[PDB]
Design a protein around this ligand. Structure first.
Ligand SMILES: [Zn+2]
Length: 260
């Protein structure tokens, strides 16, 4: 009666059901407050204030201007998936397997090492996923935010929304090595992007080589931009990043960037 969480058809199945109780002005008003709070409470797991702002602004803009996003969010709330206000955000990264880098610790990385090797050989990669901690509290881990007005911004925004859709609809990515279908999560993310005017490349498969290479490129660039935003505080930037990646609570006020 219901499509598999992995089938393309799951996308329209959840939207139709979400439409049944649409978000009212009051509902929306409360979701704004909830989102602000969750983003605020995410600060200890994010890299800088810029990323905090971009995450917050992106979600609020999506709730505000995307019918699809509202429907997906309303579905979650009314049909026993995740309430958007429960999701917190992280910038977890991991070491790359093929990287030749002298270091073996995120904390000891440098800006030069990000720019030294191109895609394939970069030192670290973001963990992009929708997961939960031991308390079953839902989180999104995602790339640090690129610069305002960077080429990478719309794709980064689309990918952030993608991860949120995993929690909020229960939708999954394709079952295997899918080169010709996006899966329901990406379909929904792409519809949101279209409604919001976020230009992204027109891929047809979740795992087609061109998509893989694009994400890799986008992520490396976002990270390089983030590191450069904190060039003066290089050592503490990477300390904060390794700390997040080691799942420790970092300063909610971004102490490691203060004048001290
Ligand atoms: Zn996914």
């Amino acid at each position: 009666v219901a499509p598999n969480r992995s089938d393309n058809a799951y996308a329209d199945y959840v939207l139709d059901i979400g439409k049944r109780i649409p978000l009212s002005a009051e509902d929306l008003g409360n979701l704004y407050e909830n989102v602000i709070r969750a983003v605020r409470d995410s600060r200890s797991k994010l890299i800088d204030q810029h990323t905090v702002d971009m995450i917050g602004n992106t979600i609020l803009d999506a709730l505000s201007r995307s019918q699809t996003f509202r429907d997906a969010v309303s579905y979650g709330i009314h049909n026993k998936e995740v309430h958007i206000g429960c999701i917190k955000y992280r910038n977890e990264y991991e070491l790359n397997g093929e990287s030749p880098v002298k270091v073996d610790d995120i904390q000891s990385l440098t800006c030069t090492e990000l720019y030294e090797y191109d895609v394939g050989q970069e030192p670290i990669l973001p963990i992009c996923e929708a997961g939960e901690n031991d308390n079953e509290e839902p989180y999104v881990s995602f790339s640090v935010a690129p610069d305002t007005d960077s080429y990478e911004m719309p794709s980064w925004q689309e990918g952030l929304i993608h991860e949120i859709i995993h929690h909020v609809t229960g939708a999954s990515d394709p079952s295997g090595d899918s080169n010709i279908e996006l899966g329901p999560t990406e379909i929904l993310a792409r519809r949101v992007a279209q409604e919001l005017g976020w230009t992204v490349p027109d891929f047809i498969g979740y795992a087609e080589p061109d998509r893989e290479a694009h994400l890799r490129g986008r992520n490396l660039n976002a990270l390089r931009q983030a590191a450069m935003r904190h060039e003066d505080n290089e050592r503490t930037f990477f300390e904060r990043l390794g700390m997040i990646s080691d799942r420790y609570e970092a300063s909610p006020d971004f102490t490691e960037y203060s004048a001290v």
